[PDB]
Design a protein around this ligand. Sequence first.
Ligand SMILES: Nc1nc2c(ncn2[C@@H]2O[C@H](COP(=O)(O)OP(=O)(O)OP(=O)(O)O)[C@@H](O)[C@H]2O)c(=O)[nH]1
Ligand SMILES: Nc1nc2c(ncn2[C@@H]2O[C@H](COP(=O)(O)OP(=O)(O)OP(=O)(O)O)[C@@H](O)[C@H]2O)c(=O)[nH]1
Ligand SMILES: Nc1nc2c(ncn2[C@@H]2O[C@H](COP(=O)(O)OP(=O)(O)O)[C@@H](O)[C@H]2O)c(=O)[nH]1
Ligand SMILES: [Mg+2]
Ligand SMILES: [Mg+2]
Lengths: 201, 428, 428, 24, 426, 12, 145
Amino acid sequence: SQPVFASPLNVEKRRLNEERALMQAQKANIQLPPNYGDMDLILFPEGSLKNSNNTVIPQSHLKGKSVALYFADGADPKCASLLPFLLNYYRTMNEGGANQKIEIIFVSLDRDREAFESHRAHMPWLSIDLENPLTEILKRHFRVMKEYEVPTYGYGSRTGVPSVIVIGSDGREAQFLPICSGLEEGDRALLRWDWRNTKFA
Amino acid sequence: MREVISIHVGQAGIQIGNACWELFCLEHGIQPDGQMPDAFNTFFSETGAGKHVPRCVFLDLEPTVVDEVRTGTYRHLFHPEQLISGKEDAANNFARGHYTIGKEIVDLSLDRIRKLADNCTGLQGFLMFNAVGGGTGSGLGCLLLERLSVDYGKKSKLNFCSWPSPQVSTAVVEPYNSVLSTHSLLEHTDVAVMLDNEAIYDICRRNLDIERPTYTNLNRLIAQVISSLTASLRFDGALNVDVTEFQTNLVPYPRIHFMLSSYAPIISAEKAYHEQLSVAEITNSAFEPASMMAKCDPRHGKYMACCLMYRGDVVPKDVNAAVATIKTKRTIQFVDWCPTGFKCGINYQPPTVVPGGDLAKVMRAVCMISNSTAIAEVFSRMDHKFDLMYAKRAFVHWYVGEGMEEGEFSEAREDLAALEKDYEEVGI
Amino acid sequence: MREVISIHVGQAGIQIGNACWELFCLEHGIQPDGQMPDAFNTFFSETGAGKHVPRCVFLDLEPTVVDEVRTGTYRHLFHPEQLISGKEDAANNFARGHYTIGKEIVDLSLDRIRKLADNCTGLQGFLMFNAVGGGTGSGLGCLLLERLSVDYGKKSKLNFCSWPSPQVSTAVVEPYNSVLSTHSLLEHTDVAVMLDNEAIYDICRRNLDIERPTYTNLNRLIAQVISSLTASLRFDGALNVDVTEFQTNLVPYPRIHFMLSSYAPIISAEKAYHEQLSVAEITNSAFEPASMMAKCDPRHGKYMACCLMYRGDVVPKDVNAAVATIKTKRTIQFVDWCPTGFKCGINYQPPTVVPGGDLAKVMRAVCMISNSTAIAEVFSRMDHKFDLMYAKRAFVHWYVGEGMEEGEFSEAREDLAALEKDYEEVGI
Amino acid sequence: YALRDHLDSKLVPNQSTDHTNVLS
Amino acid sequence: MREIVHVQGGQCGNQIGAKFWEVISDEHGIDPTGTYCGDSDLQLERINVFYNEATGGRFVPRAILMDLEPGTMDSVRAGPFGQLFRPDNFVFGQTGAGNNWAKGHYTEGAELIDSVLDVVRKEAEGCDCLQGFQITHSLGGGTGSGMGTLLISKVREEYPDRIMETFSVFPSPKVSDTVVEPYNATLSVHQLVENADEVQVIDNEALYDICFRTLKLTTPTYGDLNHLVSAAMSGVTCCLRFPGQLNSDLRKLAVNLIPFPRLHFFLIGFAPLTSRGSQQYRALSVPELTQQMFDAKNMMCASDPRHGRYLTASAMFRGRMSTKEVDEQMLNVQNKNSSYFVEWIPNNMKSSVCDIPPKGLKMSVTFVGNSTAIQEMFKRVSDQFTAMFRRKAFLHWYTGEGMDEMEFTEAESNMNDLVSEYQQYQ
Amino acid sequence: VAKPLPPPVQTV
Amino acid sequence: CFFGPDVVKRTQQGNYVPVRPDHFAGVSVALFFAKAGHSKCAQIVPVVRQFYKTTNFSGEKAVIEIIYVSLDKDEQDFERVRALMPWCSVEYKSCLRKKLIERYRVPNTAIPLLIVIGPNGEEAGRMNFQQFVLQRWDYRFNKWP
Ligand SMILES: Nc1nc2c(ncn2[C@@H]2O[C@H](COP(=O)(O)OP(=O)(O)OP(=O)(O)O)[C@@H](O)[C@H]2O)c(=O)[nH]1
Ligand SMILES: Nc1nc2c(ncn2[C@@H]2O[C@H](COP(=O)(O)OP(=O)(O)OP(=O)(O)O)[C@@H](O)[C@H]2O)c(=O)[nH]1
Ligand SMILES: Nc1nc2c(ncn2[C@@H]2O[C@H](COP(=O)(O)OP(=O)(O)O)[C@@H](O)[C@H]2O)c(=O)[nH]1
Ligand SMILES: [Mg+2]
Ligand SMILES: [Mg+2]
């Protein structure tokens, strides 16, 4: 149910693990349909997150890190103003201390492939390659739509480009960082991060 | 069994109760419909097979904020005949909320709360949430209080009203409604907290940053205050102070019950975590003149009675030391005939934090209610702005043209004048 | 194997038993086709290979509602000549129901009553369902009840009449139909119950939020009342009442057998599960004049004897506390010669909820059938309609043409008149 | 939750269980 | 709940209102064929404020159309968003109001009155309630000024508790057509003070001045005239149609904007009104909406509020903005230039916040302010009335159709009481 | 029309 | 096996999936008959949609489920309204939809309509919309085994 039902991630999650639940029940009293605590999912696939030098890493590498997706566009002036401040925040948070606290997962709303790497090369944190379905699955799941071209299921869109947004463990939503929202603090709600409260596990 | 009835009225009543009841849902551990996936029995009533329907009787005269509760995510939470929406608004007018669009909706509000009072074993308090500068929050606030006092007279009642503010208004007929709501605040109610709207704008400015907070953030800080206030009834604890103990210790004399409020762990996560939250500094911020939500600086007032409701892992050893340095502070002066009055209570259950909100996870808390005589000036700035328009009878043709008689203005004016001399004589 | 035979007469009777046998089939797990996937031997009879034909008879002079069952989903449930259809109607005429046409269908009717009583092994009574506002419920029911009292004199004759409304009419000649029918159900029935239509409209509106009820909405509430009457005759449990003690414990004098009715867990899924339902408040709602299934406001007059039949999870301790709170309040004023007038039945089976209709799984239930001296107002709105009609001798030319010489209008008027003074001296 | 009435003293009270250099 | 019924009157009233039912139908998402395509519940939760239901799911506007001349009835029906209207709401004559005020109020418009009150009655009586009646008309003409206010008087008799929201087009100061502008104007504002409520002000030279400077239309149209008024329609009736944080129905506007009963003349205005050249360069925030909406180059009345003083003002914010960010902007604009706010009413402004923005824009505000400066307009109506009446001009129509020169001179005498009353309240 | 039969009440 | 093959479609973006056979355990099922381009369907769909989300994803167990059956005349129109309805639907080319309509007596103004159904497959509650009425049906009615 978190954050919204109308989302490919949530519907495939409930389909897969609920099929798993009645596979277990056919093999063997369990409650139907299963509970929110019962449904569990691996969120990103094996070929999802790539660092600089383009080495793909598994999901378990994000253990113990406050992780946030970042929906961004190369040609967008909000993203152009946002990117140096977010680089400085990533700088300071990951360099001051003995641990790497924050980690950022990038999703692009760019026009095409060349724009995707021209925006990607400026950035050091992990990302999803645009060609796989995971980019559109994530932006449809979290409702980050630049301009309404794909019909929604009744939810008014929260935020378009840009959006840094912290992610929980099981695909849930912890909180939204208010850069372009009803609160509207671009470049200074980036410090509203809760890096030891929100932890990926 | 202990229990309490919430009697929200007005769009301020609905919206403050919206933040106050989502907090009670997450605190007790009930999901938005009815279930846990024995402290619930003071704000909810058991259905016998699941559902925890609340004890709220949410009232308004229009279907624009009631219907968004009716179609929101809490649709199967409230009993639908407790959400009572009228047909036409009072429109910032005390005369329509008391006479015109009147008795046809307050008689249906009464048998719902009669059934609530019957389906509860030993009743303790009546929490009223309203805005007194408006329409239904003042007029239906007064009709439903005159009727509540004459049949339910033995039990107490707590009017947490949104008192009109000096500078920020969002209304211009605002000085009439609250002067005429003084009857529902002076001789027909028990303890009452004057919570303002830009006093709470400042406490989230200084401490939470928040460049532009809406009403949703404001109703959640009021929800924190109300939560910790009736927290002692809900959970266990050390030495407790309950609703009947509020009036026996805060109220000195029968008419003085106009009160301030100051929660003070209102800290965001970035500010708080570079900071220790021990009970010494949270009670200096509790007595700090800007952290109180009314704008009346108590340094030019005089405290008469202070009840402090601490929450979290507050041992009684350090709260006696924390109030001890409050003695030594000269800027917090007290009245001479109440030397000993500090009534403190400690809950164990640390404050639950609303997800996606603005309070950080804090292990300690304190909410202070005070009887400072500075509250007289909260009535005097409204006395000035009532006299300015009434001097040439402005706006009163639509105060007498629908059932109210002229001359109720003048005796309500005399009630504020007698109130100001009442707070003058109680000090000296 | 205790059991009853239900005789449905008139168009109201066909549709009442239409939803009533829907409820009885759904209660005992019987398909519309008559099969199964000792309680069933009260309303259904085994016919070999797992077949349960009902124990009713449908009777009407017009062949437009009974053959309308012959081509329905329950067409292969009832016996083919159990559904007896006339050829010409009575057309709102007591004279055409009782004197002309008439007897041609009656001698075939008791051919099926006698044949149905052959399989009876301890028959306990008859349940007539008819309208006294029409012609084939009034005239045919008068000659039917008189002839059954000749054949089976000692058997119970539970008589469920839909008496005409004070305002709702659907005709104009119902003052003639029911008053001429009064001489039938006043000395040929054993317990008559009045089921006024507009009162059942108001319970479907005030409680169910259904502001547009149709006839099958009313008929399901009638089926829910009758199912609770005969619940003790099929399902076992706590302190029981049967039909034989139902007459003796509610009928003080043989001349007085008119009765009221109210079933009051009556609520749809909007409010049912949010509201806490228990024996204290469902009994208090049953005695409430707004839940009463006739326009027979019981503040008038005295009560005489009330039967409270509860089906579901009721223990015998809290039924006695519920009855005790009825004694204490002053609005329910009893008669001086019946101190201990209260007969309680408690079953174990909860109310069988019909799909589609606006009923919930209320685990408890109440089924009031209460006698009162307020029944005189049901017949005192009747007599001024009869007097204004018969003052100048109008609409009687239809009656006198088809039998019915002049004078049955006058003796029926003084018979119902003496019924009013009968209720007057029984009071004080 | 009895976390005010912590037993910090045994039956007999005996209060419960819980830089310098070298100039040799 | 909250039924508002449009009572469209005059030539100008029917194209002002045809664009009203073009922007309200766009905001609630209705095709001209009568179906819905918006896929949202919040769109379809206050349809009954302006749309009665009809069989087969088709909505109809609660809109009585009214003229004496069927040419502009044909234009409304033929145009887009025009075949949604009920055909017996088309109550029209065949003679034509020839810009004569007597011709609407005391002759032929008055025999069509019994037909137009019939269709007003049928769409008002059968309901649960109605908040008020909406009326657009064309003071200075024949129809909207003429029998148009006769329908105002008779509705005032039938329902003397409901609010009369009247969007009236006063005559232009600079230049206009229709030589008998002064004769229609004063005689109509005779009865718009006592069988009346909020009488808000709209002017043609005024609205022209927005679409030359504020919007830079090189070739403006009368459709652009009706569209700016139609944007102000949605702003003034927004909390009756969409939820907010501080809801304010249309009667709540009146109670905190009228100090004395005849003081009911309101400047209307819309913001943001940005040109295409400046579309992407400017920003959209509450300080910019406030600076634009108090800007006298934006007001839809040609009266300049700096030559006066705001008695009381009100605002209709609509968007995802902060209720805080509104209310120190109201405080700041009250404190900088306090010379244009009265001293005898403290804190001269109401603010309302609707959660739901207008169609398109992220945020928008509508200004309804009772400035006393409107006597620039009223003395302009007076001083041209004195010129024509003192030398008995054009009166052989106004007295030959069934009046006398008593009604003219006491319409003038009522009129001078109005300019006097605003004067000491300043 | 034909209706779903209720589930059987298991003995308690 | 009642429905039988893949014909019961579960929504999914990127690829198209059938909902599994015994998904319907412990849930209450309503057939939603609609047709695109109908004026009434245009408001019945969002109300039952908001009700669908609000009722179904408050409780941790899924409580309601809606099966969409359509009287469309165009497969592309059916696709663009199936992409607008968030609940389970049925295939356009499948004849199970024709069987359901012909069984349940849906005319080709009674549209749109609800029929909540029981575990075996018969009618348990009929709900039209021809004119606050949607709250009448309860999710705890058709508890399925
Ligand atoms: N604390 C708080 N105060 C509010 C809120 N909303 C409005 N108010 C205050 O309420 C005052 C006006 O009363 P309203 O609540 O808006 O209206 P009402 O009480 O329902 O009475 P009506 O005029 O009949 O609608 C405003 O001046 C605001 O200061 C809110 O969400 N929280
Ligand atoms: N409660 C209830 N009353 C009904 C129903 N059908 C008919 N009635 C009552 O019947 C009256 C109409 O006369 P009928 O009973 O139909 O006439 P009849 O007894 O069949 O005799 P005929 O006139 O020959 O058809 C109305 O006043 C209703 O009160 C029903 O289904 N339920
Ligand atoms: N904005 C606008 N103004 C108009 C329209 N038609 C007329 N007017 C103005 O209204 C004034 C008088 O209107 P007129 O047509 O003569 O009277 P009517 O037939 O009753 O409306 C004139 O000064 C016109 O400038 C219109 O369609 N739109
Ligand atoms: Mg209100
Ligand atoms: Mg008959």
